């Protein structure tokens, strides 16, 4: 029975490989052969947000594109006013081990997660002017790698249990459990229509799930090492993956097989975070070369390099209006990068 | 020009900066010890007696006006290489090895010796790229179990290349030397080896001495003398 089941599973895998090969009539490379190149993009550190006293591990942009949230191992979740460098809030975390943070779309809550296997939802808007622990979602038995709010009451958290979980904040219970990854999921991105979410794991694969059905809609592979980063295309029908292998691969949801891979002979380290631009033309990935690189998604040619940190670029984020690029690194610094006319 | 409450928000940011720097100076004053090891290898009893009466378990204890944070990660069952970099910067790694585990085999797989698994874990954690200089306080636990286990069973099962004379002293010395042999980057990392005294108190005293030595070495490196 087990041999027969394994053989038929291999047969279906072969069938889907054949389908992917048949649908790959011509990759994205040739169709963008005559596309005007992006050009040399040069960027300036318009503002440096200092005040952290340990390695910054995560950073999420507010929906207003001005408020920022940064998490570091010192045990403090700092909310910055990026426009004026003012530090709005400094929430003291119960556990100093944090590797993910999120800004709720309404801005009323911030998520914090780490090696405590607990997602702490902090309520910013209170009658008393101190941020309090609104909720402590627990049930994961592995480290939380990424958290993303949906509608101020549902949050999706990917853990080290090779599982993601949809949490109803009010009840504090796990509405749906997304299982199927062989390795522990390291990043999590949400589609703009909040209908689906894609998460990549250490099994060198990224799975696309429906949030309400609770089952793995699609699975994408092609990487050789763990997926440390994931990011949705603003169209909502594509997503990019960064891995320990120095490659960023773009898979679209309608055609499972990958479209392009971005790599160079120079860079050997691992991608830590990936974020797209608003137009989707630029894909900004942090690396372990103590700097981040801006790739052109359509032509797979390195557009630029933002060499401004003395340690690993751990978190990358792009404002919802595409006016800034926050890059938080292990040197306890966040740099907001922008272009110059 | 700055608005009235824009100025007030700047002052609030300054106050938050003052609190941040005070908290950071308090945190840099404490000793962050990363405690990891094989399961049931005396980890629980070690944290017990040096408490002096899932996720990471944080244990706070003070000895001779020195704050100590202990970070147990045994609950985590995921790939450690995905989060071990979070501990880059610990003062020391308190490794715990069951000295009596030189005969018992792993429950999950019977083809791997438990002491061999501990040796593999020690090799992985000492030679990790994130701990090229962090010292290691190695604790050979279950000393009294080994004291009676040796006169029945020999080291040959655990280590075939063993001379003989099956007594406590030479067997413990051999195990200690074998463990420190995994330390490839000598002269930059230290392995403070201690045989735990389950009936005594000096177990935390040894950790205090090792931490003081590592603090002195780090200070010398900061001043550039070394």
């Amino acid at each position, epitope marked *: 029975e087990l041999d027969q089941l394994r053989q038929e599973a291999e047969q279906l895998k072969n069938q889907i490989r054949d389908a992917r090969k048949a649908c790959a009539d011509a990759t994205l490379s040739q169709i963008t052969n005559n596309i005007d190149p992006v050009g040399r993009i040069q960027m300036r550190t318009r503002r440096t947000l200092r005040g952290h006293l340990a390695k910054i591990y995560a950073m999420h942009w507010g929906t207003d594109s*001005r*408020l920022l949230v940064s998490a570091s191992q010192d045990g403090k979740l700092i909310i910055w*006013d990026s426009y004026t460098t*003012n530090k*709005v*809030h400094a929430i003291p975390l119960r556990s100093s081990w944090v590797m993910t943070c999120a800004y709720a779309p309404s*801005g009323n809550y911030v998520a914090c997660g780490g090696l405590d296997n607990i997602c702490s939802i902090y309520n910013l*808007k209170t*009658r*008393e*002017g*101190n941020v309090r622990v609104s909720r402590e979602l627990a049930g994961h038995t592995g480290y939380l790698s990424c958290c993303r709010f949906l509608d101020d009451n549902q949050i999706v958290t990917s853990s080290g249990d090779t599982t993601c979980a949809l949490w109803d904040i009010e009840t504090g219970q796990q509405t749906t459990t997304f299982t199927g990854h062989t390795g522990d999921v390291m990043s999590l991105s949400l589609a703009p229509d909040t209908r689906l979410f894609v998460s990549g794991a250490c099994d060198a694969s990224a799975k696309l799930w429906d949030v309400r059905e609770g089952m793995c809609r699609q699975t994408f592979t092609g990487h050789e090492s763990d997926i440390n980063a994931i990011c949705f295309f603003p169209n909502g029908n594509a997503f990019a993956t960064g891995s320990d292998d120095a490659t960023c691969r773009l898979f679209d949801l309608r055609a499972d097989q990958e479209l392009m891979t971005y790599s160079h002979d120079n860079i050997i380290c691992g991608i830590t975070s990936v974020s797209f631009s608003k137009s989707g033309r630029l894909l900004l990935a942090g690396y372990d070369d103590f700097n981040c690189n801006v790739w052109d998604a359509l032509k797979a040619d390195r557009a630029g390099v933002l060499a401004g940190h003395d340690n690993r670029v751990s978190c990358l984020g792009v404002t919802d209006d595409g006016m800034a690029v926050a890059t938080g690194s292990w040197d306890s610094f966040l740099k907001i990068w922008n272009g110059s006319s | *020009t700055v*608005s*009235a*409450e*824009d*100025k*007030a*928000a700047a*002052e*609030r940011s*300054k*106050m938050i900066d003052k609190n941040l720097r005070e908290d950071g100076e308090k945190a840099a004053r404490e000793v962050k010890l990363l405690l990891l090891g094989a399961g049931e290898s005396g980890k629980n009893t070690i944290v017990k007696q040096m408490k002096i009466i899932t996720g990471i378990v944080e244990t706070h204890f003070t000895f001779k006006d020195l704050h100590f944070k202990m970070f147990d990660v045994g609950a985590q069952r995921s790939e450690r290489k995905k989060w071990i970099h979070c501990f880059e910067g610990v003062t020391a790694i308190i490794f715990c090895v069951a000295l009596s585990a030189y005969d018992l085999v792993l429950a999950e797989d019977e083809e791997m010796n438990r002491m061999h698994e501990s040796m593999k874990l020690f090799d992985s954690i000492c030679n990790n790229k994130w701990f090229t200089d962090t010292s290691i306080i190695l604790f050979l636990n279950k000393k009294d179990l080994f004291e009676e286990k040796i006169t029945h069973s020999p080291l040959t099962i655990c280590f075939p290349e063993y001379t003989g004379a099956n007594k406590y002293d030479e067997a413990a010395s051999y195990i200690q030397s074998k463990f420190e042999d995994l330390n490839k980057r000598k002269d930059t990392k230290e392995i403070y080896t201690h045989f735990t005294c389950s009936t005594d108190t000096k177990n935390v005293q040894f950790v205090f001495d090792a931490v003081t030595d590592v603090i002195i070495k780090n200070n010398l490196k900061d001043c550039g003398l070394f």
Partner: single-chain antibody
Framework: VQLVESGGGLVQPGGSRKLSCSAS????????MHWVRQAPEKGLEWVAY????????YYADTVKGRFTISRDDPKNTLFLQMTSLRSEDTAMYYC??????????????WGQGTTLTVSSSDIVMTQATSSVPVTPGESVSISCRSS???????????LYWFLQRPGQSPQLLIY???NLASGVPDRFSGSGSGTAFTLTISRLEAEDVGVYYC?????????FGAGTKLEL
């Protein structure tokens, strides 16, 4: 959230007194404290202010030097020591909390106040509307006017609207001239630009009766408006 007050009553002129606001139910240290006075039959006027941590202390020109405003965070108290009370110091005194950060709500909660009775550059706010008859269910508009433009270069306009229904302390309706307060109905709204601003009530309720004040926060000598009174 409670902001009760103590100390006051009948005092002789030229003497000394101390007003104590005993805050409870919220974080005293994070909030800035304001002392705002109201003449017995007239409108409000800003008196004093201390920031978080007592870093900056501001006074009105009328009460400069005679008054000293301080805070005791460990005991969660706000003190106003007043010396040489003239005839105009007889007033209704309020302590107001105001936390200042991006997106905050300054002047959110007001205390009951202390009644003090003694024996016998700045921006101006004009509310020429004064008293207006209102019928429940109708839509009314209250106009406020500023001496100079309050639109700072950062993009914010700096009115705060307060409603004082008869009998007790005022409450915040609109902050930053266009942002709805917390715990207040949706019908209230604010609009305008430049120097003439408006507050619109789509439907009038039984509890919307009372006086309305507009206050600026651009230049720290805060000046309240005359106050437009809506009655049935």
């Amino acid at each position: 959230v409670q902001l009760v007050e103590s100390g006051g009553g009948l005092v002789q002129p030229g003497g000394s007194r101390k007003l104590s606001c005993s805050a409870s139910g919220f974080a005293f240290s994070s909030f800035g404290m304001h002392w705002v006075r109201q003449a017995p039959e007239k409108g409000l006027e800003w008196v004093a202010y201390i920031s978080s941590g007592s870093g900056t202390i501001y006074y009105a020109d009328t009460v400069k030097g005679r008054f000293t405003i301080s805070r005791d965070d460990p005991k969660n108290t706000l003190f106003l020591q007043m010396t040489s009370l003239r005839s105009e110091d007889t007033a209704m005194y309020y302590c107001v909390r105001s936390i200042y950060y991006y997106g905050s709500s300054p002047f959110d909660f007001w205390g009951q106040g202390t009644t003090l009775t003694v024996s016998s550059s700045d921006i101006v706010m004009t509310q020429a509307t004064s008293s207006v008859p209102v019928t429940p269910g109708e839509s009314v508009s209250i106009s406020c006017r500023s001496s100079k433009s309050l639109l700072h270069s950062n993009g914010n306009t700096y009115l705060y609207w307060f409603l004082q229904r008869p009998g007790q302390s005022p409450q915040l309706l609109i902050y930053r001239m266009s942002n709805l307060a917390s715990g207040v109905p949706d019908r209230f709204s604010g609009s305008g630009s430049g120097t003439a601003f408006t507050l619109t009530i789509s439907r009038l309720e039984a509890e919307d009766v009372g006086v309305y004040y507009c206050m600026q926060h651009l230049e720290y000598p805060l000046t309240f408006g005359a106050g437009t009174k809506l009655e049935l």
